[PDB]
Design an enzyme around this catalytic site. Structure first.
Site, PDB file in Angstrom:
ATOM      1  N   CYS A   1       3.407   1.471   9.300  1.00  0.00           N
ATOM      2  CA  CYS A   1       3.408   0.360   8.346  1.00  0.00           C
ATOM      3  C   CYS A   1       4.809  -0.007   7.895  1.00  0.00           C
ATOM      4  CB  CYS A   1       2.472   0.628   7.175  1.00  0.00           C
ATOM      5  SG  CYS A   1       0.785   1.026   7.677  1.00  0.00           S
TER       6      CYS A   1
ATOM      7  N   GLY B   1       1.848   5.638   9.610  1.00  0.00           N
ATOM      8  CA  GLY B   1       3.259   5.660   9.251  1.00  0.00           C
ATOM      9  C   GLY B   1       4.057   4.543   9.909  1.00  0.00           C
TER      10      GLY B   1
ATOM     11  N   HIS C   1       0.811  -1.223   0.000  1.00  0.00           N
ATOM     12  CA  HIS C   1       0.000   0.000   0.000  1.00  0.00           C
ATOM     13  C   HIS C   1       0.857   1.292   0.000  1.00  0.00           C
ATOM     14  CE1 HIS C   1      -0.392  -0.834   4.500  1.00  0.00           C
ATOM     15  NE2 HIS C   1       0.193   0.359   4.497  1.00  0.00           N
TER      16      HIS C   1
HETATM   17  C1  LIG Z   1      -2.241   7.104   2.714  1.00  0.00           C
HETATM   18  N1  LIG Z   1      -1.810   5.721   2.864  1.00  0.00           N
HETATM   19  C2  LIG Z   1      -1.397   5.138   1.596  1.00  0.00           C
HETATM   20  C3  LIG Z   1      -2.338   4.913   3.861  1.00  0.00           C
HETATM   21  C4  LIG Z   1      -3.321   5.397   4.741  1.00  0.00           C
HETATM   22  C5  LIG Z   1      -3.900   4.567   5.686  1.00  0.00           C
HETATM   23  C6  LIG Z   1      -3.526   3.229   5.776  1.00  0.00           C
HETATM   24  N2  LIG Z   1      -4.259   2.334   6.625  1.00  0.00           N
HETATM   25  C7  LIG Z   1      -5.533   1.814   6.136  1.00  0.00           C
HETATM   26  C8  LIG Z   1      -5.384   0.537   5.351  1.00  0.00           C
HETATM   27  C9  LIG Z   1      -6.384  -0.067   4.542  1.00  0.00           C
HETATM   28  C10 LIG Z   1      -5.939  -1.179   3.890  1.00  0.00           C
HETATM   29  S1  LIG Z   1      -4.287  -1.506   4.265  1.00  0.00           S
HETATM   30  C11 LIG Z   1      -4.206  -0.153   5.296  1.00  0.00           C
HETATM   31  C12 LIG Z   1      -3.826   1.914   7.850  1.00  0.00           C
HETATM   32  O1  LIG Z   1      -4.499   1.171   8.552  1.00  0.00           O
HETATM   33  C13 LIG Z   1      -2.462   2.381   8.324  1.00  0.00           C
HETATM   34  C14 LIG Z   1      -2.322   2.342   9.832  1.00  0.00           C
HETATM   35  C15 LIG Z   1      -1.699   1.292  10.479  1.00  0.00           C
HETATM   36  N3  LIG Z   1      -1.534   1.188  11.806  1.00  0.00           N
HETATM   37  C16 LIG Z   1      -2.016   2.164  12.562  1.00  0.00           C
HETATM   38  C17 LIG Z   1      -2.697   3.295  12.052  1.00  0.00           C
HETATM   39  C18 LIG Z   1      -3.244   4.313  12.872  1.00  0.00           C
HETATM   40  C19 LIG Z   1      -3.896   5.376  12.314  1.00  0.00           C
HETATM   41  C20 LIG Z   1      -4.021   5.485  10.938  1.00  0.00           C
HETATM   42  C21 LIG Z   1      -3.515   4.520  10.114  1.00  0.00           C
HETATM   43  C22 LIG Z   1      -2.843   3.388  10.642  1.00  0.00           C
HETATM   44  C23 LIG Z   1      -2.529   2.745   4.932  1.00  0.00           C
HETATM   45  C24 LIG Z   1      -1.940   3.574   3.990  1.00  0.00           C
END
Ligand SMILES: CN(C)c1ccc(N(Cc2ccsc2)C(=O)Cc2cncc3ccccc23)cc1
Ligand SMILES: CN(C)c1ccc(N(Cc2ccsc2)C(=O)Cc2cncc3ccccc23)cc1
Lengths: 304, 304
Positions: free
Chosen positions: B145, B143, B41
Site C-alpha cells: 500500500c 505492505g 488506512h
Molecule cells: C493492518 N492493516 C492496517 C491493513 C491490512 C490489510 C489491508 N488491506 C485490506 C483493506 C480493506 C480496506 S482498504 C484495505 C489490503 O487489501 C492491503 C493489501 C493490498 N494489496 C495486496 C494485499 C495482499 C495481501 C494482503 C493485503 C493486501 C490494509 C491495511
C-alpha cells in the site's frame, strides 16, 4: 496476489546512462566510476558496418573524437581502449551516481531487466530472458545500442548485457560488459544463424508454481511422471531437458505449494500434449518461460 | 523491432518513496515537495479494517505518531490532514529528489507504470492498464500500500494511482493522488462488487497495428467492416464499443501501416469469431489490450 512480468526498478541504472557520439554515430554508454562502456561499433559509419576492421577504424580515432554527454554536461575523455566488442572511454570524472555494481556473465535461461535508452536518455524498462540460443527478444530501435541488461540484489547492480545488434530475424544480440558476445554473433551486418532455440522448461515449471500460488489451479492433475518420461515429452515439444539440478532449484516452490516437482512435471506434460483448450494461466494463453524459480519466489515474497 | 510490455523508467518515482509507520502499521508514502502522501488506512490496525471510522481513528493520532523514514533518515512531521482516502503528512523538509510532477485522474482503458514498494523501498516495476471496471490486475502483496502508478512525459511525472487494497477476487483497487477511489470501492475489508469488465477494443486494435509494424501480419485479411457491424461483434465478445473518437486516435497507426482502421477492425472481427487457431501475435496467444495507441507509437518511435 497477482503475477506480472516485473522488471527491477531502473533508477540505479538511469544514473549511469550517457550519450556517446563518434563522428556521425551516436549511441548509449554506461558511466561507472571514471569509465564509460559502449559498443565498439560507435566508431563505424553505415559504409563500415558490412565488415568493419575495428582495430583500423579505432586507430583513426583519438580521445577528443569521442563525445560523451551526461545529461547536459560534457565528460572529458582522457583514454580509450577496445576490449572484445566494447570500448572503454576513461573520463576525468567519476560518476557521482555510480551504484555498487558487478559485471556478470549470465547463463541462458536466466532473466534480467533492460533499460532501453536513446541519446543517453532512458525510454523504458522491460523484463526478458536470455534465450537458450543466446538471443534476446527485446524491443530495440536504431540508436538503442549501449542499453544494458541488469539484475539488482539489494543495492548491487549486476550488469549482464549490453545491446549491440538486431539480427535480420528481429531478435537481439549483444555482449557481457567485457564485450564478449552472447552466442555465436559478431558485430557485422551479415546474415547470422541464431541456432535452434528451446523453451526454458525450469522457468515454465516455476511459472506453473506461481499460477498455483496466485489462484490458478485448473491445470493440476491426478498424475505424476518420472524425469525420463517427462524428458521424452520435453524432447518432442522442443523443451530443455529437465535435470536433478532443475528439480533442486524448484525445491522452495514445491515446498510452498506442497506439489511435488514430478507432479508439476506431469501437469506440464498434459498441457504440452493437450494445449490450454481455450483456457488461460496468469493471463496468458501460452506456456510462459520468462520467469525463473528465483523471480517467482522474489515476486511472491516481496524482496526489495 | 520487437514489442514488449514496457514500463517507464522508475528512477524519478524511486526518489519519492518513503516508509510511513503509524502505530503497528507500516506502508509506503510519496514524498513530493514538503508533503508525504499515503493511504489513510495506515492509521488502522487489523481490528479496525472491517469498518473503520477514519475521522475517529485520525483524531487519536498526532504529528509525532506518524513515523516517516526516507531511506535511513527520519522526516519531521509538522502537519497532517485527510483528503478523501489519503493522508497528507506535511514535513519540515522538501524532497531534494522531487521531480517535475502532476496529479492526474486517468480514464479507464489508459495505461501506467506501477512501482511496487515495501517498507518505502522499491521492489519492481510493471506496466498495466486501468480496467474498464476501474480495477487493476497488478502484483501486490501486504505492505505494498502506498505504491503509485504513473506516466512520464519527458521530465514530468504524472502520478495517477496509489495502491490501497486487494479485493477478495485478487484484483487491485486504489485512488488518484487526491484520495478518490477509482471505481465504486471503499477502503473497508468487505466484499465489493467490481462490476462487469470489458476488453479495451481500441488498445487491442492499437496492438494489432504494433504487430504489423513488428512483422506479424498473418491475421490481416481481404475483408472490411463498418463501425456498426464491428460493434455487433464487439457486443457478443464483451469488447468496448468502438466510436469515431477511437478511430481518430488510431489515425497515426493507420497512416503508418496504410491499413484502414475499419480494415483492421475486420481482422479483429475474424480473430474474435475464429480465435488464434494455435497461432501467436507478438508472443501472445490471446488478444492484448494493455497497450494504448500512444504506447504503441511511443515504443515504435523511441521517445525518451
Ligand atoms: C493492518 N492493516 C492496517 C491493513 C491490512 C490489510 C489491508 N488491506 C485490506 C483493506 C480493506 C480496506 S482498504 C484495505 C489490503 O487489501 C492491503 C493489501 C493490498 N494489496 C495486496 C494485499 C495482499 C495481501 C494482503 C493485503 C493486501 C490494509 C491495511
Ligand atoms: C551506423 N551505425 C554505426 C550502425 C548502424 C546499424 C547498426 N546495427 C547493425 C549491426 C551490425 C553489426 S553490430 C550492429 C544494428 O543492428 C543496430 C540496431 C540495434 N537494435 C535495433 C535496431 C533496429 C533497427 C536498426 C538498427 C538496430 C549498428 C550501428
Amino acid at each position: 496476489s497477482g503475477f506480472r512480468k516485473m522488471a527491477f526498478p531502473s533508477g540505479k541504472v538511469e544514473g549511469c546512462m550517457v550519450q556517446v557520439t563518434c563522428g556521425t554515430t551516436t549511441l548509449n554508454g554506461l558511466w561507472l566510476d571514471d569509465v564509460v562502456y559502449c559498443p565498439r561499433h560507435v566508431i563505424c559509419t553505415s559504409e563500415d558496418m558490412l565488415n568493419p576492421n575495428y582495430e583500423d577504424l579505432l586507430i583513426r580515432k583519438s580521445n577528443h573524437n569521442f563525445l560523451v554527454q551526461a545529461g547536459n554536461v560534457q565528460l572529458r575523455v582522457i583514454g580509450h581502449s577496445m576490449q572484445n566488442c566494447v570500448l572503454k572511454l576513461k573520463v576525468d570524472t567519476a560518476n557521482p551516481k555510480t551504484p555498487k555494481y558487478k559485471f556478470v556473465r549470465i547463463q541462458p535461461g536466466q532473466t534480467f531487466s533492460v533499460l532501453a535508452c536513446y541519446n543517453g536518455s532512458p525510454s523504458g524498462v522491460y523484463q526478458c530472458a536470455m534465450r537458450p540460443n543466446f538471443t534476446i527478444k527485446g524491443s530495440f530501435l536504431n540508436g538503442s545500442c549501449g542499453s544494458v541488461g541488469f539484475n539488482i540484489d539489494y543495492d548491487c547492480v549486476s550488469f549482464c548485457y549490453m545491446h549491440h545488434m538486431e539480427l535480420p530475424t528481429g531478435v537481439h544480440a549483444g555482449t557481457d560488459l567485457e564485450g564478449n558476445f552472447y552466442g555465436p554473433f559478431v558485430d557485422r551486418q551479415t546474415a547470422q544463424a541464431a541456432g535452434t532455440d528451446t523453451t526454458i522448461t525450469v522457468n515454465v515449471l516455476a511459472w506453473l508454481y506461481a499460477a498455483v500460488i496466485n489462484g490458478d489451479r485448473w491445470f493440476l492433475n491426478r498424475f505424476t511422471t518420472t524425469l525420463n518420461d517427462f524428458n521424452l515429452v520435453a524432447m518432442k515439444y522442443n523443451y530443455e531437458p529437465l535435470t536433478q539440478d532443475h528439480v533442486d532449484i524448484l525445491g522452495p516452490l514445491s515446498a510452498q505449494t506442497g506439489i511435488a516437482v514430478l507432479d508439476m512435471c506431469a501437469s506440464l506434460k498434459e498441457l504440452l500434449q493437450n494445449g490450454m483448450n481455450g483456457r488461460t494461466i496468469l493471463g496468458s494463453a501460452l506456456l510462459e518461460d520468462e520467469f525463473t524459480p528465483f523471480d517467482v519466489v522474489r515476486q511472491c515474497s516481496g524482496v526489495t
